[PDB]
Structure formats: C-alpha cells, structure tokens
Amino acid sequence: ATIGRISTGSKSLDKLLGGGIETQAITEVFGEFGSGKTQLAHTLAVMVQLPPEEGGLNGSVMWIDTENTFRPERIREIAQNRGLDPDEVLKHIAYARAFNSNHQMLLVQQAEDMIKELLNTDRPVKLLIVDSLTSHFRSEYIGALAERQQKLAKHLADLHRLANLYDIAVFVTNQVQANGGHILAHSATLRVYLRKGKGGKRIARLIDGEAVFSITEKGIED
Ligand SMILES: Oc1cc2ccccc2cc1O
C-alpha cells in the first residue's frame, strides 16, 4: 500500500511531519504530564475520519486507553467543530480500557480481529491509538528494568506488525518528565517531543524546526 497521512488538525504540525502522521508507521509522542499528548490523540481520532481532500483517510479508529483519559464528549466537540456528525465519529471509534500491561498486550492481538473484519470495507481501520503505551509497564516493573524492556519490545513489535501488515497509523503516547526516560528508545518510526510554551501554546519537535499550535474546540489548530 502507499503511505497514507492523517492530518493532525494543525498546518504547522502537519508541515513538521511531512503532511501528517503516516500509516505503516508508529508515531510516538512524548512529553510531561499536561503537554497535550491526549489532546492530539483525540484530534487524530476525528481527523482520520475525514476524506483525503480534508486530510483524513475515511478511516475507523481503535483506541486502547490505559489511564481512563478517553473522553467521548471531547470527541463530540472536535467532530462538531470539524464539520462531522459526532454520533458517526464515535460509532467509528472502537474503545477498550487496558487493565494492566498483560491485558494491554492481549488487546493488540484482539485488535487484529476487528482490523481484519473491516479491511475490505469503506471504513477500514486506519488509526490505532495506545494512550498511554508505557504507564502500566512503568508501574508494574519498578526495579525490574530488563524484564520491562523485554515485554515492551514484544509489544512494540506487535504494533509494528499491525501498522505494516494492515496499512494503519499507530499513534502512542509516553509520559516523560523529571529524571525519566528511555523514551521508547529507537523503536518508534518517529518520535515527537511535545511541550508547553508560553501562553498555553504547545510546541512539537522531531527527535532523531518546531511546530506550534493551540488546543481549541477544533482539537488542535494553528
Ligand atoms: O470491540 C473491541 C474494541 C477494541 C479496542 C481496542 C483494542 C481492541 C479492541 C477489541 C475489540 O473487540
């Protein structure tokens, strides 16, 4: 398949990304608590449902939530301010809460079944969100870094396999602050560092210029 791109909602961030986040790729956004990673996830879950002329892929979404941070009412707001019907947008987001890191890993295998079911339809899965990818692994494997890295490596390999095999954009969030961070090392296809700037602006930079955007009723925008 050709590489599809999903607009983030911000022209600035899209330019930094070469058009948007890519299918057949894992995009990892990392930054401190409150930097806007989950807002970007919510915005992408709407944008992907637009037609390509508007920066989407007419796609369905699957969302694995590890921190109870998915907000359907926020999806509704972004959808209504992106000219989409909010009910239709929510009907095309499959949502699961991961109870722990092992359940999170099983959910990726379960996601493959729905991906296959929708593959030949007019609304194939085009976006798989894992928010937060690392939170359960970090809490469960305190003092056991080597084992944590083994499990994360398999989890990321599973996500890679889905991105490439089914032409999906995988978007994962990772909280990194004071003294923290192996990030995801070199595993993601693309690492985006997100941070707060003056006056509530958000700033993004590729790791391995800078885009600037705001959180608004449209999700994010310039
Ligand atoms: O109904 C489902 C929703 C999911 C969401 C995320 C990952 C896997 C899922 C599997 C489902 O059957």
Atom of ligand 1 minimally distant from the CA of 111: 8
**Which tokens go with 157?**
């390999």
| Strands lying side by side in the sheet with 219-221 | 93-97, 60-65, 125-131, 169-175, 25-31, 190-196, 202-207, 211-216, 219-221
Burial 174-183 (b: 16+ CB within 10 A, else e): bbbeeeeeeb
Alpha-carbon distance of 131 to 31, in angstroms, equals: 13
Residue 6: strand pairing partners:
21
Is residue 90 exposed (0-12), middle (13-18) or buried (19+ Cβ within 10 Å)? Answer: middle
Residue 79 has, within 13 A of its CA and on its CB side, a CA count of: 20
Please work out whether the CB of residue 220 comes within 6 Å of at least one atom of ligand 1: no
HEC sequence for 110-171: HHHHHHHHHCCCCCCEEEEEEECCCHHHHHHCCCCHHHHHHHHHHHHHHHHHHHHHHCCEEE
Please name the method used to determine this structure: X-ray
What length does the chain have? Answer: 222
Please work out whether the CB of residue 157 comes within 6 Å of at least one atom of ligand 1: no
Alpha-carbon distance of 63 to 58, in angstroms, equals: 16
How many Å lie between the centroid of ligand 1 and the Cα of residue 96?
Answer: 5
**Which tokens go with 94?**
């499959």
**Ligand 1 mutation pick, 114, 128, 171, max ligand atoms within 8 A of CB:** 114
Alpha-carbon distance of 173 to 38, in angstroms, equals: 7
Do 107 and 96 meet the contact criterion of CB atoms below 8 Å apart? yes
HEC sequence for the chain: CCCCEECCCCHHHHHHCCCCEECCEEEEEEECCCCCHHHHHHHHHHHCCCCHHHCCCCCEEEEEECCCCCCHHHHHHHHHCCCCCHHHHHHCEEEEECCCHHHHHHHHHHHHHHHHHHCCCCCCEEEEEEECCCHHHHHHCCCCHHHHHHHHHHHHHHHHHHHHHHCCEEEEEEECCCCCCCCCCCCCCEEEEEEECHHHCEEEEEECCCEEEEEECCEEEC
The amino acid sitting at 221 is: E
Pairing type for strands 5-6 and 21-22 reads: antiparallel
How many Å lie between the centroid of ligand 1 and the Cα of residue 201?
Answer: 33
Closest CA to 221 of 14, 83, 26, 34: 14
Alpha-carbon distance of 6 to 203, in angstroms, equals: 19
Please work out whether the CB of residue 170 comes within 6 Å of at least one atom of ligand 1: no
Alpha carbon 38 to its chain's center:
8
**φ, ψ for residue 104 (rounded to 5)?**
-55, -40
How many Å lie between the centroid of ligand 1 and the Cα of residue 34?
Answer: 26
Q: ω before 12 within 30° of 0 (cis)? A: no
Whose tokens are 């003294």? That residue is: 179
How many Å lie between the centroid of ligand 1 and the Cα of residue 131?
Answer: 14
How many Å lie between the centroid of ligand 1 and the Cα of residue 111?
Answer: 5
Alpha-carbon distance of 96 to 129, in angstroms, equals: 10
